[PDB]
Amino acid sequence: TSSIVHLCAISLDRYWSITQAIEYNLKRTPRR
């Protein structure tokens, strides 16, 4: 039970950072 979460806690983070940088620039606006 606890051996999962943790894990899950890894595989997610990885994508966390990414996401955070995406949206960043995603629909942005841009503006533009």
Side-chain angles (χ1 to χ4, degrees):
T1 281
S2 225
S3 207
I4 295 178
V5 170
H6 203 85
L7 207 125
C8 244
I10 296 189
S11 233
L12 182 68
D13 218 81
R14 216 206 210 182
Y15 306 118
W16 170 240
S17 212
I18 297 169
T19 295
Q20 222 214 0
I22 285 173
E23 216 157 43
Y24 227 122
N25 255 249
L26 184 119
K27 187 190 146 172
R28 223 205 138 190
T29 120
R31 202 249 123 173
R32 307 157 209 263

PDB file of all heavy atoms in Angstrom:
ATOM      1  N   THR A   1       0.638  -0.952   0.000  1.00  0.00           N
ATOM      2  CA  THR A   1       0.000   0.000   0.000  1.00  0.00           C
ATOM      3  C   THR A   1       0.819   1.222   0.000  1.00  0.00           C
ATOM      4  O   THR A   1       0.554   2.141  -0.638  1.00  0.00           O
ATOM      5  CB  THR A   1      -0.797  -0.158   0.938  1.00  0.00           C
ATOM      6  OG1 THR A   1      -1.547  -0.731   0.747  1.00  0.00           O
ATOM      7  CG2 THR A   1      -1.487   0.589   1.307  1.00  0.00           C
ATOM      8  N   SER A   2       1.797   1.192   0.724  1.00  0.00           N
ATOM      9  CA  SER A   2       2.656   2.284   0.815  1.00  0.00           C
ATOM     10  C   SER A   2       3.742   2.191  -0.158  1.00  0.00           C
ATOM     11  O   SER A   2       4.501   3.067  -0.318  1.00  0.00           O
ATOM     12  CB  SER A   2       3.177   2.383   2.166  1.00  0.00           C
ATOM     13  OG  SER A   2       3.290   3.065   2.731  1.00  0.00           O
ATOM     14  N   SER A   3       3.780   1.120  -0.783  1.00  0.00           N
ATOM     15  CA  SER A   3       4.761   0.899  -1.737  1.00  0.00           C
ATOM     16  C   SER A   3       4.289   1.265  -3.067  1.00  0.00           C
ATOM     17  O   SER A   3       4.824   1.042  -3.940  1.00  0.00           O
ATOM     18  CB  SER A   3       5.165  -0.501  -1.699  1.00  0.00           C
ATOM     19  OG  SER A   3       6.261  -0.713  -2.070  1.00  0.00           O
ATOM     20  N   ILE A   4       3.295   1.821  -3.180  1.00  0.00           N
ATOM     21  CA  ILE A   4       2.747   2.220  -4.390  1.00  0.00           C
ATOM     22  C   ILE A   4       2.747   3.691  -4.473  1.00  0.00           C
ATOM     23  O   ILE A   4       3.326   4.275  -5.336  1.00  0.00           O
ATOM     24  CB  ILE A   4       1.430   1.585  -4.554  1.00  0.00           C
ATOM     25  CG1 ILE A   4       1.509   0.134  -4.673  1.00  0.00           C
ATOM     26  CG2 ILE A   4       0.749   2.182  -5.676  1.00  0.00           C
ATOM     27  CD1 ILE A   4       1.280  -0.514  -4.741  1.00  0.00           C
ATOM     28  N   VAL A   5       2.092   4.249  -3.563  1.00  0.00           N
ATOM     29  CA  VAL A   5       2.009   5.641  -3.522  1.00  0.00           C
ATOM     30  C   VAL A   5       3.322   6.256  -3.822  1.00  0.00           C
ATOM     31  O   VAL A   5       3.470   7.008  -4.738  1.00  0.00           O
ATOM     32  CB  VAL A   5       1.467   6.041  -2.223  1.00  0.00           C
ATOM     33  CG1 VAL A   5       1.603   7.502  -2.055  1.00  0.00           C
ATOM     34  CG2 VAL A   5       0.074   5.581  -2.062  1.00  0.00           C
ATOM     35  N   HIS A   6       4.240   5.914  -3.035  1.00  0.00           N
ATOM     36  CA  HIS A   6       5.535   6.422  -3.205  1.00  0.00           C
ATOM     37  C   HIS A   6       5.909   6.405  -4.636  1.00  0.00           C
ATOM     38  O   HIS A   6       6.297   7.384  -5.199  1.00  0.00           O
ATOM     39  CB  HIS A   6       6.462   5.685  -2.351  1.00  0.00           C
ATOM     40  CG  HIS A   6       7.650   6.358  -2.011  1.00  0.00           C
ATOM     41  ND1 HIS A   6       7.730   6.998  -1.251  1.00  0.00           N
ATOM     42  CD2 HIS A   6       8.802   6.484  -2.335  1.00  0.00           C
ATOM     43  CE1 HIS A   6       8.884   7.483  -1.130  1.00  0.00           C
ATOM     44  NE2 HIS A   6       9.545   7.163  -1.803  1.00  0.00           N
ATOM     45  N   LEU A   7       5.780   5.282  -5.185  1.00  0.00           N
ATOM     46  CA  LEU A   7       6.099   5.124  -6.539  1.00  0.00           C
ATOM     47  C   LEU A   7       5.360   6.096  -7.357  1.00  0.00           C
ATOM     48  O   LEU A   7       5.937   6.846  -8.109  1.00  0.00           O
ATOM     49  CB  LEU A   7       5.874   3.719  -6.920  1.00  0.00           C
ATOM     50  CG  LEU A   7       6.576   3.220  -7.902  1.00  0.00           C
ATOM     51  CD1 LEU A   7       7.156   2.415  -7.954  1.00  0.00           C
ATOM     52  CD2 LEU A   7       6.229   2.975  -8.656  1.00  0.00           C
ATOM     53  N   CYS A   8       4.093   6.050  -7.182  1.00  0.00           N
ATOM     54  CA  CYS A   8       3.270   6.918  -7.895  1.00  0.00           C
ATOM     55  C   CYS A   8       3.774   8.301  -7.724  1.00  0.00           C
ATOM     56  O   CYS A   8       3.591   9.136  -8.556  1.00  0.00           O
ATOM     57  CB  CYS A   8       1.866   6.755  -7.463  1.00  0.00           C
ATOM     58  SG  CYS A   8       0.928   6.221  -8.635  1.00  0.00           S
ATOM     59  N   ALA A   9       4.400   8.501  -6.642  1.00  0.00           N
ATOM     60  CA  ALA A   9       4.933   9.769  -6.351  1.00  0.00           C
ATOM     61  C   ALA A   9       6.144  10.056  -7.106  1.00  0.00           C
ATOM     62  O   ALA A   9       6.645  10.904  -6.910  1.00  0.00           O
ATOM     63  CB  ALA A   9       5.146   9.846  -4.951  1.00  0.00           C
ATOM     64  N   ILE A  10       6.580   9.337  -7.954  1.00  0.00           N
ATOM     65  CA  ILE A  10       7.722   9.504  -8.738  1.00  0.00           C
ATOM     66  C   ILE A  10       7.347   9.706 -10.145  1.00  0.00           C
ATOM     67  O   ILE A  10       7.762  10.654 -10.761  1.00  0.00           O
ATOM     68  CB  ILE A  10       8.613   8.368  -8.527  1.00  0.00           C
ATOM     69  CG1 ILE A  10       9.091   8.332  -7.145  1.00  0.00           C
ATOM     70  CG2 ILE A  10       9.709   8.405  -9.504  1.00  0.00           C
ATOM     71  CD1 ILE A  10       9.610   7.977  -6.637  1.00  0.00           C
ATOM     72  N   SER A  11       6.568   8.801 -10.612  1.00  0.00           N
ATOM     73  CA  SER A  11       6.133   8.867 -11.935  1.00  0.00           C
ATOM     74  C   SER A  11       5.311  10.072 -12.128  1.00  0.00           C
ATOM     75  O   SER A  11       5.105  10.411 -12.782  1.00  0.00           O
ATOM     76  CB  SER A  11       5.370   7.628 -12.309  1.00  0.00           C
ATOM     77  OG  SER A  11       5.522   7.126 -12.992  1.00  0.00           O
ATOM     78  N   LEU A  12       4.864  10.686 -11.548  1.00  0.00           N
ATOM     79  CA  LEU A  12       4.070  11.845 -11.648  1.00  0.00           C
ATOM     80  C   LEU A  12       4.916  13.091 -11.644  1.00  0.00           C
ATOM     81  O   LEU A  12       4.841  13.886 -12.457  1.00  0.00           O
ATOM     82  CB  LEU A  12       3.048  11.812 -10.605  1.00  0.00           C
ATOM     83  CG  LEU A  12       2.261  12.423 -10.335  1.00  0.00           C
ATOM     84  CD1 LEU A  12       1.444  12.724 -10.598  1.00  0.00           C
ATOM     85  CD2 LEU A  12       1.639  12.465  -9.765  1.00  0.00           C
ATOM     86  N   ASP A  13       5.702  13.220 -10.719  1.00  0.00           N
ATOM     87  CA  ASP A  13       6.562  14.356 -10.598  1.00  0.00           C
ATOM     88  C   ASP A  13       7.257  14.609 -11.897  1.00  0.00           C
ATOM     89  O   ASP A  13       7.305  15.727 -12.375  1.00  0.00           O
ATOM     90  CB  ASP A  13       7.596  14.102  -9.556  1.00  0.00           C
ATOM     91  CG  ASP A  13       7.915  15.183  -8.766  1.00  0.00           C
ATOM     92  OD1 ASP A  13       7.888  15.492  -8.432  1.00  0.00           O
ATOM     93  OD2 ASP A  13       8.180  15.675  -8.513  1.00  0.00           O
ATOM     94  N   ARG A  14       7.779  13.549 -12.430  1.00  0.00           N
ATOM     95  CA  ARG A  14       8.469  13.641 -13.663  1.00  0.00           C
ATOM     96  C   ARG A  14       7.715  14.510 -14.636  1.00  0.00           C
ATOM     97  O   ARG A  14       8.248  15.368 -15.288  1.00  0.00           O
ATOM     98  CB  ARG A  14       8.673  12.268 -14.241  1.00  0.00           C
ATOM     99  CG  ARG A  14       9.918  12.157 -14.898  1.00  0.00           C
ATOM    100  CD  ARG A  14      10.013  11.316 -15.803  1.00  0.00           C
ATOM    101  NE  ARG A  14      10.970  10.970 -15.857  1.00  0.00           N
ATOM    102  CZ  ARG A  14      11.467  10.491 -16.242  1.00  0.00           C
ATOM    103  NH1 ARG A  14      11.099  10.301 -16.611  1.00  0.00           N
ATOM    104  NH2 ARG A  14      12.330  10.204 -16.261  1.00  0.00           N
ATOM    105  N   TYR A  15       6.486  14.258 -14.702  1.00  0.00           N
ATOM    106  CA  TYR A  15       5.653  15.005 -15.584  1.00  0.00           C
ATOM    107  C   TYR A  15       5.195  16.273 -14.978  1.00  0.00           C
ATOM    108  O   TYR A  15       4.655  16.951 -15.415  1.00  0.00           O
ATOM    109  CB  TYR A  15       4.498  14.130 -15.831  1.00  0.00           C
ATOM    110  CG  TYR A  15       4.830  12.775 -16.324  1.00  0.00           C
ATOM    111  CD1 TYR A  15       4.868  12.071 -16.326  1.00  0.00           C
ATOM    112  CD2 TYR A  15       5.095  12.257 -16.765  1.00  0.00           C
ATOM    113  CE1 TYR A  15       5.181  10.796 -16.791  1.00  0.00           C
ATOM    114  CE2 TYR A  15       5.408  10.983 -17.229  1.00  0.00           C
ATOM    115  CZ  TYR A  15       5.436  10.315 -17.220  1.00  0.00           C
ATOM    116  OH  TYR A  15       5.732   9.111 -17.658  1.00  0.00           O
ATOM    117  N   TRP A  16       5.426  16.555 -13.982  1.00  0.00           N
ATOM    118  CA  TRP A  16       5.043  17.730 -13.311  1.00  0.00           C
ATOM    119  C   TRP A  16       5.803  18.890 -13.859  1.00  0.00           C
ATOM    120  O   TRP A  16       5.260  19.843 -14.342  1.00  0.00           O
ATOM    121  CB  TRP A  16       5.210  17.533 -11.864  1.00  0.00           C
ATOM    122  CG  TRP A  16       5.056  18.785 -11.074  1.00  0.00           C
ATOM    123  CD1 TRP A  16       5.926  19.351 -10.306  1.00  0.00           C
ATOM    124  CD2 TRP A  16       3.923  19.606 -11.005  1.00  0.00           C
ATOM    125  NE1 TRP A  16       5.438  20.473  -9.750  1.00  0.00           N
ATOM    126  CE2 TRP A  16       4.182  20.633 -10.189  1.00  0.00           C
ATOM    127  CE3 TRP A  16       2.719  19.486 -11.614  1.00  0.00           C
ATOM    128  CZ2 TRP A  16       3.284  21.618  -9.905  1.00  0.00           C
ATOM    129  CZ3 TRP A  16       1.833  20.478 -11.320  1.00  0.00           C
ATOM    130  CH2 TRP A  16       2.078  21.519 -10.500  1.00  0.00           C
ATOM    131  N   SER A  17       7.051  18.771 -13.765  1.00  0.00           N
ATOM    132  CA  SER A  17       7.891  19.797 -14.245  1.00  0.00           C
ATOM    133  C   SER A  17       7.591  20.087 -15.659  1.00  0.00           C
ATOM    134  O   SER A  17       7.521  21.047 -16.029  1.00  0.00           O
ATOM    135  CB  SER A  17       9.312  19.412 -14.073  1.00  0.00           C
ATOM    136  OG  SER A  17      10.076  20.367 -13.849  1.00  0.00           O
ATOM    137  N   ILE A  18       7.424  19.241 -16.412  1.00  0.00           N
ATOM    138  CA  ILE A  18       7.134  19.395 -17.777  1.00  0.00           C
ATOM    139  C   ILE A  18       5.886  20.196 -17.959  1.00  0.00           C
ATOM    140  O   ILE A  18       5.879  21.222 -18.598  1.00  0.00           O
ATOM    141  CB  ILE A  18       7.100  18.059 -18.417  1.00  0.00           C
ATOM    142  CG1 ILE A  18       8.417  17.377 -18.355  1.00  0.00           C
ATOM    143  CG2 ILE A  18       6.588  18.191 -19.788  1.00  0.00           C
ATOM    144  CD1 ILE A  18       8.671  16.506 -18.543  1.00  0.00           C
ATOM    145  N   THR A  19       4.861  19.697 -17.386  1.00  0.00           N
ATOM    146  CA  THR A  19       3.610  20.354 -17.475  1.00  0.00           C
ATOM    147  C   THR A  19       3.726  21.808 -17.159  1.00  0.00           C
ATOM    148  O   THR A  19       3.217  22.652 -17.865  1.00  0.00           O
ATOM    149  CB  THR A  19       2.690  19.618 -16.595  1.00  0.00           C
ATOM    150  OG1 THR A  19       2.500  18.584 -16.943  1.00  0.00           O
ATOM    151  CG2 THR A  19       1.569  20.003 -16.571  1.00  0.00           C
ATOM    152  N   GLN A  20       4.397  22.058 -16.098  1.00  0.00           N
ATOM    153  CA  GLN A  20       4.586  23.396 -15.680  1.00  0.00           C
ATOM    154  C   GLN A  20       5.241  24.177 -16.705  1.00  0.00           C
ATOM    155  O   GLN A  20       5.213  25.012 -16.709  1.00  0.00           O
ATOM    156  CB  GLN A  20       5.335  23.427 -14.439  1.00  0.00           C
ATOM    157  CG  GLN A  20       5.012  24.182 -13.558  1.00  0.00           C
ATOM    158  CD  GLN A  20       5.286  24.674 -12.925  1.00  0.00           C
ATOM    159  OE1 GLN A  20       5.595  24.611 -12.961  1.00  0.00           O
ATOM    160  NE2 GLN A  20       5.156  25.164 -12.348  1.00  0.00           N
ATOM    161  N   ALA A  21       5.815  23.877 -17.548  1.00  0.00           N
ATOM    162  CA  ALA A  21       6.476  24.539 -18.575  1.00  0.00           C
ATOM    163  C   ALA A  21       5.719  24.462 -19.798  1.00  0.00           C
ATOM    164  O   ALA A  21       5.997  24.850 -20.538  1.00  0.00           O
ATOM    165  CB  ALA A  21       7.798  23.967 -18.731  1.00  0.00           C
ATOM    166  N   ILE A  22       4.778  23.958 -19.970  1.00  0.00           N
ATOM    167  CA  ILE A  22       3.979  23.825 -21.090  1.00  0.00           C
ATOM    168  C   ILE A  22       2.938  24.750 -21.121  1.00  0.00           C
ATOM    169  O   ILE A  22       2.757  25.456 -21.929  1.00  0.00           O
ATOM    170  CB  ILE A  22       3.497  22.535 -21.248  1.00  0.00           C
ATOM    171  CG1 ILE A  22       4.375  21.674 -21.683  1.00  0.00           C
ATOM    172  CG2 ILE A  22       2.444  22.609 -22.050  1.00  0.00           C
ATOM    173  CD1 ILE A  22       4.240  20.627 -21.774  1.00  0.00           C
ATOM    174  N   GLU A  23       2.283  24.717 -20.230  1.00  0.00           N
ATOM    175  CA  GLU A  23       1.264  25.545 -20.146  1.00  0.00           C
ATOM    176  C   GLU A  23       1.686  26.771 -20.095  1.00  0.00           C
ATOM    177  O   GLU A  23       1.031  27.509 -20.207  1.00  0.00           O
ATOM    178  CB  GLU A  23       0.619  25.282 -19.112  1.00  0.00           C
ATOM    179  CG  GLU A  23      -0.539  25.408 -19.199  1.00  0.00           C
ATOM    180  CD  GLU A  23      -1.153  25.144 -18.849  1.00  0.00           C
ATOM    181  OE1 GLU A  23      -1.401  25.035 -18.657  1.00  0.00           O
ATOM    182  OE2 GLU A  23      -1.358  25.057 -18.781  1.00  0.00           O
ATOM    183  N   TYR A  24       2.777  26.954 -19.927  1.00  0.00           N
ATOM    184  CA  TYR A  24       3.293  28.077 -19.861  1.00  0.00           C
ATOM    185  C   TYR A  24       3.245  28.640 -21.041  1.00  0.00           C
ATOM    186  O   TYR A  24       3.019  29.674 -21.176  1.00  0.00           O
ATOM    187  CB  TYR A  24       4.583  27.839 -19.369  1.00  0.00           C
ATOM    188  CG  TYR A  24       5.044  28.489 -18.487  1.00  0.00           C
ATOM    189  CD1 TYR A  24       5.203  28.418 -18.095  1.00  0.00           C
ATOM    190  CD2 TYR A  24       5.300  29.148 -18.084  1.00  0.00           C
ATOM    191  CE1 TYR A  24       5.636  29.030 -17.265  1.00  0.00           C
ATOM    192  CE2 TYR A  24       5.734  29.760 -17.255  1.00  0.00           C
ATOM    193  CZ  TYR A  24       5.880  29.671 -16.886  1.00  0.00           C
ATOM    194  OH  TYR A  24       6.289  30.250 -16.103  1.00  0.00           O
ATOM    195  N   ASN A  25       3.463  27.933 -21.867  1.00  0.00           N
ATOM    196  CA  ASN A  25       3.448  28.349 -23.031  1.00  0.00           C
ATOM    197  C   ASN A  25       2.648  27.621 -23.826  1.00  0.00           C
ATOM    198  O   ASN A  25       3.083  26.972 -24.482  1.00  0.00           O
ATOM    199  CB  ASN A  25       4.693  28.235 -23.415  1.00  0.00           C
ATOM    200  CG  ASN A  25       5.273  29.248 -23.464  1.00  0.00           C
ATOM    201  OD1 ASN A  25       5.471  29.523 -24.055  1.00  0.00           O
ATOM    202  ND2 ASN A  25       5.533  29.788 -22.808  1.00  0.00           N
ATOM    203  N   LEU A  26       1.492  27.753 -23.740  1.00  0.00           N
ATOM    204  CA  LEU A  26       0.626  27.116 -24.442  1.00  0.00           C
ATOM    205  C   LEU A  26      -0.340  27.928 -25.038  1.00  0.00           C
ATOM    206  O   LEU A  26      -0.440  28.029 -26.043  1.00  0.00           O
ATOM    207  CB  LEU A  26       0.128  26.205 -23.774  1.00  0.00           C
ATOM    208  CG  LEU A  26      -0.686  25.454 -24.390  1.00  0.00           C
ATOM    209  CD1 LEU A  26      -0.565  24.484 -24.524  1.00  0.00           C
ATOM    210  CD2 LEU A  26      -1.509  25.457 -24.113  1.00  0.00           C
ATOM    211  N   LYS A  27      -1.028  28.483 -24.394  1.00  0.00           N
ATOM    212  CA  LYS A  27      -1.983  29.282 -24.848  1.00  0.00           C
ATOM    213  C   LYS A  27      -1.792  30.427 -24.346  1.00  0.00           C
ATOM    214  O   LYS A  27      -2.486  30.845 -23.755  1.00  0.00           O
ATOM    215  CB  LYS A  27      -3.197  28.851 -24.725  1.00  0.00           C
ATOM    216  CG  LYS A  27      -4.091  29.220 -25.072  1.00  0.00           C
ATOM    217  CD  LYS A  27      -5.116  29.043 -24.951  1.00  0.00           C
ATOM    218  CE  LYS A  27      -5.768  29.612 -24.965  1.00  0.00           C
ATOM    219  NZ  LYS A  27      -6.625  29.505 -24.961  1.00  0.00           N
ATOM    220  N   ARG A  28      -0.846  30.901 -24.600  1.00  0.00           N
ATOM    221  CA  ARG A  28      -0.555  31.989 -24.180  1.00  0.00           C
ATOM    222  C   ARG A  28      -0.612  32.811 -25.047  1.00  0.00           C
ATOM    223  O   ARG A  28      -0.560  32.473 -25.901  1.00  0.00           O
ATOM    224  CB  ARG A  28       0.649  31.973 -23.579  1.00  0.00           C
ATOM    225  CG  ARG A  28       0.762  32.362 -22.873  1.00  0.00           C
ATOM    226  CD  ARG A  28       1.705  32.726 -22.521  1.00  0.00           C
ATOM    227  NE  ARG A  28       2.015  33.280 -22.205  1.00  0.00           N
ATOM    228  CZ  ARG A  28       2.417  33.560 -22.041  1.00  0.00           C
ATOM    229  NH1 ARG A  28       2.561  33.339 -22.163  1.00  0.00           N
ATOM    230  NH2 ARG A  28       2.676  34.060 -21.755  1.00  0.00           N
ATOM    231  N   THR A  29      -0.717  33.875 -24.797  1.00  0.00           N
ATOM    232  CA  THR A  29      -0.781  34.748 -25.544  1.00  0.00           C
ATOM    233  C   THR A  29      -0.654  35.004 -25.729  1.00  0.00           C
ATOM    234  O   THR A  29      -0.621  35.300 -25.771  1.00  0.00           O
ATOM    235  CB  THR A  29      -1.019  35.170 -25.762  1.00  0.00           C
ATOM    236  OG1 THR A  29      -0.698  35.594 -25.694  1.00  0.00           O
ATOM    237  CG2 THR A  29      -1.279  35.676 -25.622  1.00  0.00           C
ATOM    238  N   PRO A  30      -0.586  34.879 -25.842  1.00  0.00           N
ATOM    239  CA  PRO A  30      -0.464  35.094 -26.022  1.00  0.00           C
ATOM    240  C   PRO A  30      -0.559  36.184 -26.608  1.00  0.00           C
ATOM    241  O   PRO A  30      -0.905  36.803 -27.064  1.00  0.00           O
ATOM    242  CB  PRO A  30      -0.377  34.578 -25.933  1.00  0.00           C
ATOM    243  CG  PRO A  30      -0.493  34.374 -25.882  1.00  0.00           C
ATOM    244  CD  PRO A  30      -0.622  34.530 -25.798  1.00  0.00           C
ATOM    245  N   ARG A  31      -0.245  36.386 -26.577  1.00  0.00           N
ATOM    246  CA  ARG A  31      -0.289  37.391 -27.100  1.00  0.00           C
ATOM    247  C   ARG A  31       0.051  37.410 -27.272  1.00  0.00           C
ATOM    248  O   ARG A  31       0.284  36.916 -27.002  1.00  0.00           O
ATOM    249  CB  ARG A  31      -0.373  37.786 -26.949  1.00  0.00           C
ATOM    250  CG  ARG A  31      -0.598  38.373 -27.262  1.00  0.00           C
ATOM    251  CD  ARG A  31      -0.645  38.588 -27.365  1.00  0.00           C
ATOM    252  NE  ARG A  31      -0.721  38.839 -27.546  1.00  0.00           N
ATOM    253  CZ  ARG A  31      -0.793  39.136 -27.681  1.00  0.00           C
ATOM    254  NH1 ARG A  31      -0.799  39.223 -27.656  1.00  0.00           N
ATOM    255  NH2 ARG A  31      -0.858  39.348 -27.841  1.00  0.00           N
ATOM    256  N   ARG A  32       0.070  37.985 -27.722  1.00  0.00           N
ATOM    257  CA  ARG A  32       0.378  38.075 -27.934  1.00  0.00           C
ATOM    258  C   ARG A  32       0.345  39.001 -28.307  1.00  0.00           C
ATOM    259  O   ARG A  32       0.373  39.158 -28.233  1.00  0.00           O
ATOM    260  CB  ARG A  32       0.426  37.987 -28.171  1.00  0.00           C
ATOM    261  CG  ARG A  32       0.391  37.540 -28.116  1.00  0.00           C
ATOM    262  CD  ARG A  32       0.367  37.703 -28.334  1.00  0.00           C
ATOM    263  NE  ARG A  32       0.164  37.458 -28.419  1.00  0.00           N
ATOM    264  CZ  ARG A  32       0.187  37.179 -28.609  1.00  0.00           C
ATOM    265  NH1 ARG A  32       0.402  37.105 -28.735  1.00  0.00           N
ATOM    266  NH2 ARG A  32      -0.007  36.972 -28.673  1.00  0.00           N
TER     267      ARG A  32
END
